[PDB]
């Protein structure tokens, strides 16, 4: 469940 694009960066995506 790690490894997705949504998890890739420190700040949340908008």
């Amino acid at each position, epitope marked *: 469940l790690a*490894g997705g*694009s949504a*998890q890739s960066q420190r700040a949340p995506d908008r």
Partner: antibody, heavy 117, light 113 residues
Framework: QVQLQESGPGLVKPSETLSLTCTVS?????????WNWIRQPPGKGLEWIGS???????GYNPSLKSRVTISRDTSKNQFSLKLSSVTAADTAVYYC??????????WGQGTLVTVSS | DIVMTQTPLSLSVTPGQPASISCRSS???????????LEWYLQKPGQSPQLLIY???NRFSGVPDRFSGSGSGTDFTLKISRVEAEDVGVYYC?????????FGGGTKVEIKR
């Protein structure tokens, strides 16, 4: 310039452990992003092996999970891949890549690993 | 896992003419945060893949250019509006919405001449 550079190509005997590193320059691995491994077996398409995040969190392809380990060595700004128990099916070009919300913007040059005795 | 099925498998296109590639996914690649992490790459002969489009329709160049991405849910399209010699290679769609991230099988684009 962000640049990713995989270690060199060569042989690994079957049943042994394939080992690769990616060295990152122009950017610190712990600043942000996720640091991916992806392979392309001869004449086939691209398979995601797994990644490690800027914060050390690893994710794996469920199909490969039991044979894969990924780590970071922040002292050399590198991240690594080990793939154990290999066979000819693991012969491939292995790529490292940086992932963000906005894509795999940067790739290493690709390193061919041949699994043979 | 999400299967990404590209059609067609290959294309021949006369320079200056358009091409269109389709990518269908076996399940939605809308993520819970609302974003759709659908990306397109080109892999030129002997090279690493290079990103063209991210988040469905955002151009890597950041500026209006010959690559256009569209679609939603399970159905996506890359258009190349005026193919040039330099565009030749294999195109892949990719989804990073659900683990594991998966690529399409690729569509090989050749110049008809």
């Amino acid at each position: 310039q962000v640049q990713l550079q995989e270690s060199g190509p060569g042989l690994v005997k079957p049943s042994e452990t394939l080992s690769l590193t990616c060295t990152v320059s122009g950017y610190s691995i712990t600043s942000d992003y996720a640091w991916n491994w992806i392979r392309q077996p001869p004449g086939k398409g691209l398979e995601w092996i797994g990644s490690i995040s800027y914060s050390g969190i690893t994710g794996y392809n469920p199909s490969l999970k039991s044979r894969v380990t990924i780590s970071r060595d922040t002292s050399k700004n590198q991240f690594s891949l080990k793939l154990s128990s290999v066979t000819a099916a693991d012969t491939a070009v292995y790529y490292c890549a940086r992932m963000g919300y906005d894509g795999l913007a940067y790739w290493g040059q690709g390193t061919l690993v041949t699994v043979s005795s | 896992d999400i299967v990404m099925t590209q059609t067609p498998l290959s294309l021949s296109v006369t320079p200056g003419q358009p091409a269109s590639i389709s990518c269908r996914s076996s399940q939605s690649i809308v993520h819970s945060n609302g974003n759709t992490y659908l990306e397109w790459y080109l892999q030129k002969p002997g090279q690493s893949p290079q990103l063209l489009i991210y988040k469905v329709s955002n151009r890597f160049s950041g500026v209006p250019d010959r690559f256009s991405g569209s679609g939603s849910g399970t159905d996506f399209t890359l258009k190349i509006s005026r193919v040039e010699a330099e565009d030749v290679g294999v195109y892949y769609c990719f989804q990073g919405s659900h683990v594991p991230p998966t690529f399409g099988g690729g569509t090989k684009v050749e110049i008809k001449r």
